[PDB]
Amino acid sequence: AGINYVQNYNGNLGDFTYDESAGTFSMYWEDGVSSDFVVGLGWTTGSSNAITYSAEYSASGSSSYLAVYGWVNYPQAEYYIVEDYGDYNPCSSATSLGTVYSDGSTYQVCTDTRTNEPSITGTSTFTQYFSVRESTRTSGTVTVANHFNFWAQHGFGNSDFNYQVMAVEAWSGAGSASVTISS
């Protein structure tokens, strides 16, 4: 997998375990969380390369994602390719950009502006981009290039990437997950 980056934003909200050279991690939050964590494994510098994963993901009662997750340095952007999720669809509140088809499913696409919020530069203003899979799954290949090229039509810089990971995120409710990245 060539993992060279560990994502750990508030992993101590639950039980985050990882092994970089295996490309495995797990995150248990079965007692619930009241604030956001984002944990996972991947690459110091993102690219349009496809990502292949497999997971156990049990988040039905949780505001949670199983997602490709990363940033663009500038113009600053936080992005998600949500493969499965719990009780919160980001495209319910956010601005719809339509849909894109990739790897066997429609994805709902949306965007939001975050003003003076936590970022990879302290607190800042950035744009969020989300692809949310209509047919949810816990294993497969994400053709990242199809999401990047679609988002790029709506302002996504599609260059000058920061880190890029397969992640589990949750900020409300309880759940558990165990993930393997192969590529």
PDB file of C-alpha atoms in Angstrom:
ATOM      1  CA  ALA A   1       0.000   0.000   0.000  1.00  0.00           C
ATOM      2  CA  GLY A   2       3.035   2.321   0.588  1.00  0.00           C
ATOM      3  CA  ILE A   3       1.319   3.937   3.670  1.00  0.00           C
ATOM      4  CA  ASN A   4       3.586   6.794   4.892  1.00  0.00           C
ATOM      5  CA  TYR A   5       1.000   8.916   6.786  1.00  0.00           C
ATOM      6  CA  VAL A   6      -1.063   8.263   9.923  1.00  0.00           C
ATOM      7  CA  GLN A   7      -4.278  10.350  10.413  1.00  0.00           C
ATOM      8  CA  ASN A   8      -5.090  10.841  14.104  1.00  0.00           C
ATOM      9  CA  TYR A   9      -7.451  13.733  14.928  1.00  0.00           C
ATOM     10  CA  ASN A  10      -8.758  13.041  18.474  1.00  0.00           C
ATOM     11  CA  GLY A  11      -8.291   9.239  18.182  1.00  0.00           C
ATOM     12  CA  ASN A  12      -8.325   9.304  22.056  1.00  0.00           C
ATOM     13  CA  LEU A  13     -12.159   9.891  21.802  1.00  0.00           C
ATOM     14  CA  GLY A  14     -12.145   6.074  21.421  1.00  0.00           C
ATOM     15  CA  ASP A  15      -9.757   3.129  20.778  1.00  0.00           C
ATOM     16  CA  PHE A  16      -7.658   3.800  17.628  1.00  0.00           C
ATOM     17  CA  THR A  17      -5.172   1.044  16.627  1.00  0.00           C
ATOM     18  CA  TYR A  18      -3.017   0.923  13.474  1.00  0.00           C
ATOM     19  CA  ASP A  19      -0.139  -0.802  11.740  1.00  0.00           C
ATOM     20  CA  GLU A  20       1.309   1.276   8.809  1.00  0.00           C
ATOM     21  CA  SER A  21       3.259  -1.548   7.012  1.00  0.00           C
ATOM     22  CA  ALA A  22       0.150  -3.861   7.219  1.00  0.00           C
ATOM     23  CA  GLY A  23      -2.104  -0.979   6.066  1.00  0.00           C
ATOM     24  CA  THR A  24      -4.623  -1.809   8.811  1.00  0.00           C
ATOM     25  CA  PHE A  25      -6.380   0.213  11.486  1.00  0.00           C
ATOM     26  CA  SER A  26      -9.393  -0.057  13.750  1.00  0.00           C
ATOM     27  CA  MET A  27     -11.447   2.438  15.720  1.00  0.00           C
ATOM     28  CA  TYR A  28     -13.948   1.472  18.483  1.00  0.00           C
ATOM     29  CA  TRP A  29     -16.289   4.125  19.899  1.00  0.00           C
ATOM     30  CA  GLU A  30     -18.998   1.785  21.293  1.00  0.00           C
ATOM     31  CA  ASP A  31     -19.569   4.066  24.391  1.00  0.00           C
ATOM     32  CA  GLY A  32     -20.298   6.989  21.968  1.00  0.00           C
ATOM     33  CA  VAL A  33     -18.501  10.339  21.318  1.00  0.00           C
ATOM     34  CA  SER A  34     -19.684  13.983  21.805  1.00  0.00           C
ATOM     35  CA  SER A  35     -17.018  15.544  19.463  1.00  0.00           C
ATOM     36  CA  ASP A  36     -15.324  14.799  16.122  1.00  0.00           C
ATOM     37  CA  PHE A  37     -12.512  12.296  15.465  1.00  0.00           C
ATOM     38  CA  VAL A  38     -10.909  11.429  12.083  1.00  0.00           C
ATOM     39  CA  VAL A  39      -8.478   8.490  12.022  1.00  0.00           C
ATOM     40  CA  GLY A  40      -6.907   6.430   9.227  1.00  0.00           C
ATOM     41  CA  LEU A  41      -3.866   5.625   7.066  1.00  0.00           C
ATOM     42  CA  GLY A  42      -2.571   6.792   3.694  1.00  0.00           C
ATOM     43  CA  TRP A  43      -0.108   9.193   1.993  1.00  0.00           C
ATOM     44  CA  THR A  44       1.709  12.423   2.927  1.00  0.00           C
ATOM     45  CA  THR A  45       0.834  13.888  -0.506  1.00  0.00           C
ATOM     46  CA  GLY A  46      -2.478  12.991  -2.157  1.00  0.00           C
ATOM     47  CA  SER A  47      -2.925  12.246  -5.838  1.00  0.00           C
ATOM     48  CA  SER A  48      -5.626  11.054  -8.303  1.00  0.00           C
ATOM     49  CA  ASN A  49      -4.412   7.404  -7.813  1.00  0.00           C
ATOM     50  CA  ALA A  50      -7.194   4.861  -7.096  1.00  0.00           C
ATOM     51  CA  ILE A  51      -7.589   3.598  -3.528  1.00  0.00           C
ATOM     52  CA  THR A  52      -8.567  -0.055  -2.700  1.00  0.00           C
ATOM     53  CA  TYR A  53      -9.907  -0.926   0.748  1.00  0.00           C
ATOM     54  CA  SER A  54     -11.931  -3.423   2.759  1.00  0.00           C
ATOM     55  CA  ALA A  55     -13.626  -2.809   6.092  1.00  0.00           C
ATOM     56  CA  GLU A  56     -15.971  -3.925   8.843  1.00  0.00           C
ATOM     57  CA  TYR A  57     -18.023  -0.783   9.524  1.00  0.00           C
ATOM     58  CA  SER A  58     -20.833  -0.678  12.080  1.00  0.00           C
ATOM     59  CA  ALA A  59     -22.014   2.933  12.470  1.00  0.00           C
ATOM     60  CA  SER A  60     -25.823   2.768  11.944  1.00  0.00           C
ATOM     61  CA  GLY A  61     -26.529   4.813  15.113  1.00  0.00           C
ATOM     62  CA  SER A  62     -23.588   7.266  14.615  1.00  0.00           C
ATOM     63  CA  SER A  63     -22.890  10.558  12.784  1.00  0.00           C
ATOM     64  CA  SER A  64     -19.954   8.774  11.033  1.00  0.00           C
ATOM     65  CA  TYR A  65     -18.254   8.196   7.645  1.00  0.00           C
ATOM     66  CA  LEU A  66     -16.082   5.513   6.065  1.00  0.00           C
ATOM     67  CA  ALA A  67     -14.376   7.666   3.415  1.00  0.00           C
ATOM     68  CA  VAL A  68     -11.421   8.670   1.312  1.00  0.00           C
ATOM     69  CA  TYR A  69     -10.453  11.929   3.135  1.00  0.00           C
ATOM     70  CA  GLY A  70      -7.845  14.590   2.358  1.00  0.00           C
ATOM     71  CA  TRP A  71      -6.981  18.221   1.720  1.00  0.00           C
ATOM     72  CA  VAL A  72      -5.868  20.583  -1.037  1.00  0.00           C
ATOM     73  CA  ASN A  73      -3.327  23.093   0.388  1.00  0.00           C
ATOM     74  CA  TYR A  74      -4.570  26.060  -1.655  1.00  0.00           C
ATOM     75  CA  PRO A  75      -7.165  27.116  -2.502  1.00  0.00           C
ATOM     76  CA  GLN A  76      -7.777  25.329   0.810  1.00  0.00           C
ATOM     77  CA  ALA A  77     -10.267  22.387   0.590  1.00  0.00           C
ATOM     78  CA  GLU A  78     -11.286  19.409   2.751  1.00  0.00           C
ATOM     79  CA  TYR A  79     -12.722  16.507   0.698  1.00  0.00           C
ATOM     80  CA  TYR A  80     -14.513  13.166   1.209  1.00  0.00           C
ATOM     81  CA  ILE A  81     -15.474  10.243  -0.991  1.00  0.00           C
ATOM     82  CA  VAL A  82     -17.973   8.653   1.427  1.00  0.00           C
ATOM     83  CA  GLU A  83     -18.324   4.878   0.794  1.00  0.00           C
ATOM     84  CA  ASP A  84     -20.564   4.182   3.782  1.00  0.00           C
ATOM     85  CA  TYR A  85     -21.998   6.267   6.635  1.00  0.00           C
ATOM     86  CA  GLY A  86     -24.427   6.301   9.613  1.00  0.00           C
ATOM     87  CA  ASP A  87     -27.204   8.755  10.491  1.00  0.00           C
ATOM     88  CA  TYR A  88     -25.826  11.891   8.711  1.00  0.00           C
ATOM     89  CA  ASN A  89     -25.686  12.589   4.941  1.00  0.00           C
ATOM     90  CA  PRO A  90     -23.560  15.767   4.412  1.00  0.00           C
ATOM     91  CA  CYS A  91     -25.530  16.417   1.178  1.00  0.00           C
ATOM     92  CA  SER A  92     -28.754  16.916   3.301  1.00  0.00           C
ATOM     93  CA  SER A  93     -27.581  20.381   4.618  1.00  0.00           C
ATOM     94  CA  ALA A  94     -24.917  21.314   1.949  1.00  0.00           C
ATOM     95  CA  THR A  95     -25.161  22.876  -1.589  1.00  0.00           C
ATOM     96  CA  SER A  96     -25.892  20.138  -4.198  1.00  0.00           C
ATOM     97  CA  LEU A  97     -23.547  19.995  -7.241  1.00  0.00           C
ATOM     98  CA  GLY A  98     -25.465  17.049  -8.815  1.00  0.00           C
ATOM     99  CA  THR A  99     -24.182  13.463  -9.156  1.00  0.00           C
ATOM    100  CA  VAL A 100     -21.205  11.595 -10.573  1.00  0.00           C
ATOM    101  CA  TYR A 101     -21.035   7.846 -11.439  1.00  0.00           C
ATOM    102  CA  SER A 102     -17.920   5.847 -10.400  1.00  0.00           C
ATOM    103  CA  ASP A 103     -17.029   2.251  -9.435  1.00  0.00           C
ATOM    104  CA  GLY A 104     -20.570   0.879  -9.817  1.00  0.00           C
ATOM    105  CA  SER A 105     -22.632   3.630  -8.076  1.00  0.00           C
ATOM    106  CA  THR A 106     -24.081   7.068  -8.436  1.00  0.00           C
ATOM    107  CA  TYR A 107     -22.575   9.501  -5.870  1.00  0.00           C
ATOM    108  CA  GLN A 108     -24.488  12.600  -4.631  1.00  0.00           C
ATOM    109  CA  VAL A 109     -22.021  15.563  -4.797  1.00  0.00           C
ATOM    110  CA  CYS A 110     -22.216  18.689  -2.619  1.00  0.00           C
ATOM    111  CA  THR A 111     -20.070  21.503  -1.259  1.00  0.00           C
ATOM    112  CA  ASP A 112     -20.068  23.736   1.822  1.00  0.00           C
ATOM    113  CA  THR A 113     -17.957  26.674   3.095  1.00  0.00           C
ATOM    114  CA  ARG A 114     -16.389  26.382   6.588  1.00  0.00           C
ATOM    115  CA  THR A 115     -15.466  29.847   8.016  1.00  0.00           C
ATOM    116  CA  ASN A 116     -12.668  30.036  10.640  1.00  0.00           C
ATOM    117  CA  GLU A 117     -12.891  26.318  11.529  1.00  0.00           C
ATOM    118  CA  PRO A 118     -10.244  23.744  12.485  1.00  0.00           C
ATOM    119  CA  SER A 119      -8.034  22.914   9.487  1.00  0.00           C
ATOM    120  CA  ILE A 120      -4.518  21.713   8.588  1.00  0.00           C
ATOM    121  CA  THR A 121      -3.467  25.389   9.095  1.00  0.00           C
ATOM    122  CA  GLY A 122      -4.889  25.916  12.618  1.00  0.00           C
ATOM    123  CA  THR A 123      -8.270  27.584  12.023  1.00  0.00           C
ATOM    124  CA  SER A 124      -9.120  28.950   8.581  1.00  0.00           C
ATOM    125  CA  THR A 125     -11.789  29.327   5.901  1.00  0.00           C
ATOM    126  CA  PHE A 126     -11.987  26.452   3.397  1.00  0.00           C
ATOM    127  CA  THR A 127     -14.355  24.696   1.033  1.00  0.00           C
ATOM    128  CA  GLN A 128     -15.663  21.139   1.657  1.00  0.00           C
ATOM    129  CA  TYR A 129     -16.325  18.773  -1.282  1.00  0.00           C
ATOM    130  CA  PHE A 130     -18.295  15.505  -0.734  1.00  0.00           C
ATOM    131  CA  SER A 131     -19.152  12.551  -2.997  1.00  0.00           C
ATOM    132  CA  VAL A 132     -21.645  10.333  -1.081  1.00  0.00           C
ATOM    133  CA  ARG A 133     -22.182   6.797  -2.492  1.00  0.00           C
ATOM    134  CA  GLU A 134     -25.910   6.037  -3.169  1.00  0.00           C
ATOM    135  CA  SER A 135     -25.260   2.240  -2.942  1.00  0.00           C
ATOM    136  CA  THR A 136     -23.186   2.116   0.306  1.00  0.00           C
ATOM    137  CA  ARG A 137     -20.398  -0.484   0.594  1.00  0.00           C
ATOM    138  CA  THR A 138     -17.471  -1.418   2.905  1.00  0.00           C
ATOM    139  CA  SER A 139     -15.003  -2.661   0.283  1.00  0.00           C
ATOM    140  CA  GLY A 140     -13.966  -1.774  -3.276  1.00  0.00           C
ATOM    141  CA  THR A 141     -11.832   0.489  -5.462  1.00  0.00           C
ATOM    142  CA  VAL A 142     -12.356   4.280  -5.486  1.00  0.00           C
ATOM    143  CA  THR A 143     -11.399   5.805  -8.836  1.00  0.00           C
ATOM    144  CA  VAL A 144     -10.388   9.071  -7.077  1.00  0.00           C
ATOM    145  CA  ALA A 145      -9.718  10.681 -10.505  1.00  0.00           C
ATOM    146  CA  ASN A 146     -13.464  10.566 -11.348  1.00  0.00           C
ATOM    147  CA  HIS A 147     -14.351  12.508  -8.151  1.00  0.00           C
ATOM    148  CA  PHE A 148     -11.459  15.022  -8.546  1.00  0.00           C
ATOM    149  CA  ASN A 149     -12.327  15.759 -12.216  1.00  0.00           C
ATOM    150  CA  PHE A 150     -16.029  16.238 -11.352  1.00  0.00           C
ATOM    151  CA  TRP A 151     -15.275  18.500  -8.333  1.00  0.00           C
ATOM    152  CA  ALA A 152     -12.809  20.494 -10.485  1.00  0.00           C
ATOM    153  CA  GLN A 153     -15.768  21.673 -12.681  1.00  0.00           C
ATOM    154  CA  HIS A 154     -17.126  23.362  -9.441  1.00  0.00           C
ATOM    155  CA  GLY A 155     -13.892  25.047  -8.176  1.00  0.00           C
ATOM    156  CA  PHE A 156     -11.868  22.166  -6.591  1.00  0.00           C
ATOM    157  CA  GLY A 157      -8.200  23.086  -7.196  1.00  0.00           C
ATOM    158  CA  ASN A 158      -7.310  19.470  -8.204  1.00  0.00           C
ATOM    159  CA  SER A 159      -3.560  20.069  -7.483  1.00  0.00           C
ATOM    160  CA  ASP A 160      -1.204  20.999  -4.593  1.00  0.00           C
ATOM    161  CA  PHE A 161      -2.583  18.189  -2.418  1.00  0.00           C
ATOM    162  CA  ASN A 162      -1.806  17.727   1.259  1.00  0.00           C
ATOM    163  CA  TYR A 163      -2.390  14.295   2.879  1.00  0.00           C
ATOM    164  CA  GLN A 164      -4.876  11.674   1.584  1.00  0.00           C
ATOM    165  CA  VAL A 165      -6.151   8.736   3.714  1.00  0.00           C
ATOM    166  CA  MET A 166      -8.789   6.023   4.009  1.00  0.00           C
ATOM    167  CA  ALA A 167     -10.524   7.244   7.165  1.00  0.00           C
ATOM    168  CA  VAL A 168     -13.233   6.608   9.734  1.00  0.00           C
ATOM    169  CA  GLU A 169     -14.799   9.767  11.183  1.00  0.00           C
ATOM    170  CA  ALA A 170     -17.531  10.185  13.821  1.00  0.00           C
ATOM    171  CA  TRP A 171     -18.740  13.103  15.983  1.00  0.00           C
ATOM    172  CA  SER A 172     -22.001  11.734  17.553  1.00  0.00           C
ATOM    173  CA  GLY A 173     -23.377   8.313  18.584  1.00  0.00           C
ATOM    174  CA  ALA A 174     -21.513   4.974  18.890  1.00  0.00           C
ATOM    175  CA  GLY A 175     -19.948   2.451  16.555  1.00  0.00           C
ATOM    176  CA  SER A 176     -16.871   0.477  15.531  1.00  0.00           C
ATOM    177  CA  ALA A 177     -14.738  -0.152  12.398  1.00  0.00           C
ATOM    178  CA  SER A 178     -11.733  -2.157  11.204  1.00  0.00           C
ATOM    179  CA  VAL A 179     -10.099  -1.257   7.835  1.00  0.00           C
ATOM    180  CA  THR A 180      -7.456  -2.630   5.416  1.00  0.00           C
ATOM    181  CA  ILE A 181      -5.928  -0.562   2.531  1.00  0.00           C
ATOM    182  CA  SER A 182      -4.311  -2.621  -0.273  1.00  0.00           C
ATOM    183  CA  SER A 183      -3.561   0.130  -2.878  1.00  0.00           C
TER     184      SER A 183
END
